[PDB]
Design a protein around this ligand. Structure first.
Ligand SMILES: O=C(O)c1sccc1-n1cccc1
Ligand SMILES: O=C(O)c1sccc1-n1cccc1
Lengths: 265, 263
């Protein structure tokens, strides 16, 4: 991987692995979401981060994901090479945005795109806060100054408000627990696990006859290593649409809400 | 990746990814076991395949009976690890696949693995000796002289594993596979079982020790809708005896041993 000529974005190529593919012999949406993490971390490292700034580390401040929106046109096949380009952008005091473009290395065509929204949180108190100018000026030199949007469209799916699923749900997967392989290097549940957990309540018949096209996921609360999760889904719709809810098996505390769009194979 | 000059083994380099590392900022044993799958599949593909044309005609598949992994140094995030793999016949019982893991910068051996495979009818799940027609098809891709990742006489890779007695010292109950645990044929990926065995090791062992050796026997497959119990008892360096069984009737699916060194 490497930063582009202007040093305002980062590119990296990935060969799709044998264990990274599903039943259709193409990369899963969780494999893709992991590749977005890998290109994201390599972009931060190539510009001095390790992505907390000097001031964030001093104040015990971290960047946390509020929303992830992924849209896939063609999932890459096992053995194919996918090139991913990523960049960040400031959104005032609310936080930052990280976008991605996925391409076929052989054809140069766009096979997918993603956008994520990040907010600042105190690592210990878990309290959110608006970005301070001292922190803001530290990373503004690594972002483009003109708007560069993976989803520019006048009316796009990445900014839609997601409602809360009403009980009873149509489908459900109960008693989901994270294992050590679901944890990151800081012993927190990896954000991609939640994507997998949302998809767990989609019936196998939809999974076998449709391909996931769009997924929007809001992150409200973290699932701890010793928590149990319930995954709920209700059909809201040639296209299938679903409303999703992740909550703690006990009290029913919400951790995530989302929507998926699937098209017939 | 590529086959070596003699076309009797396969090499491939891997850069360790951010999501592939644990709390020590080094690759997990499950990440390593997945890299062994990837280099294994690329070796088969580069030589025409691990089912032969005769196996497909008879509905025969290769299944893992045993996996033995020994790690001296887990690679760090960003490091490049080079893996060399090769297969070898073991008569009529089956085949063996071995691996050597190295540091790309130093050339030193950082780990090694050996796995034992048997032939099974994919439909009846019945084991069988390898026929000569099948055997001759793949013998041209294996070295003719013995080439062993674990040559040492009376080594840990060939030891018999006993069955854990109830009550177990530690346990993790109600383990279920999710879609990300399945392979391209909707079967549970063999690496998931490794993760499930380690689930019953206490977090205090995990935080103070590093896994050095893991030997895992595969007896029965966990179906997508099965629930698993992971049992562990200390037998000792820390040594543990492991057992994976179905949450209901208690049917055995796996047994193993792990060896851990103080950090
Ligand atoms: O989880 C993270 O910290 C990172 S880093 C860049 C992408 C993501 N992400 C968030 C949701 C799914 C993937
Ligand atoms: O599972 C498989 O089919 C393959 S392919 C080569 C290595 C393995 N394996 C088996 C146990 C752990 C890894």
């Amino acid at each position: 991987g490497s930063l582009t000529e202007d040093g305002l974005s980062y590119k990296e190529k990935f060969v799709v692995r044998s264990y990274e593919v599903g039943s259709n012999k193409t990369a899963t949406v969780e494999t893709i979401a992991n590749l977005l993490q890998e290109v994201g971390c390599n972009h931060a490292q190539s510009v001095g981060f390790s992505a907390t700034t000097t001031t964030m580390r001093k104040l015990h401040l971290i960047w946390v994901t509020a929303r992830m929106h992924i849209e896939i046109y063609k999932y890459p096949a096992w053995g194919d090479v996918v090139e991913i380009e990523t960049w960040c952008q400031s959104e005032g005091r609310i936080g930052t945005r990280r976008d991605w473009i996925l391409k076929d290395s052989v054809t140069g065509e766009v096979t997918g795109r993603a956008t994520s929204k990040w907010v600042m949180m105190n690592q210990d108190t878990r309290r959110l806060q608006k970005v301070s100018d001292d922190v803001r000026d530290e990373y503004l030199v690594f972002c483009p100054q003109e708007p560069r949007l993976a989803f520019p469209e006048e009316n796009n799916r990445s900014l839609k408000k997601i409602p809360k699923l009403e009980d009873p749900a149509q489908y459900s997967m109960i008693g989901l627990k994270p294992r050590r392989a679901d944890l990151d290097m800081n012993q927190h549940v990896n954000n991609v696990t939640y994507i997998g957990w949302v998809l767990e309540s989609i019936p196998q018949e939809i999974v076998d006859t449709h391909e996931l096209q769009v997924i929007t996921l809001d992150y409200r609360r973290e699932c701890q290593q010793d928590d149990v999760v319930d995954s709920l889904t209700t059909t809201t719709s040639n296209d299938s649409q679903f409303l999703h809810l992740l909550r703690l098996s006990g009290d029913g505390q919400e951790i995530n809400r989302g929507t998926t769009l699937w098209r017939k194979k």
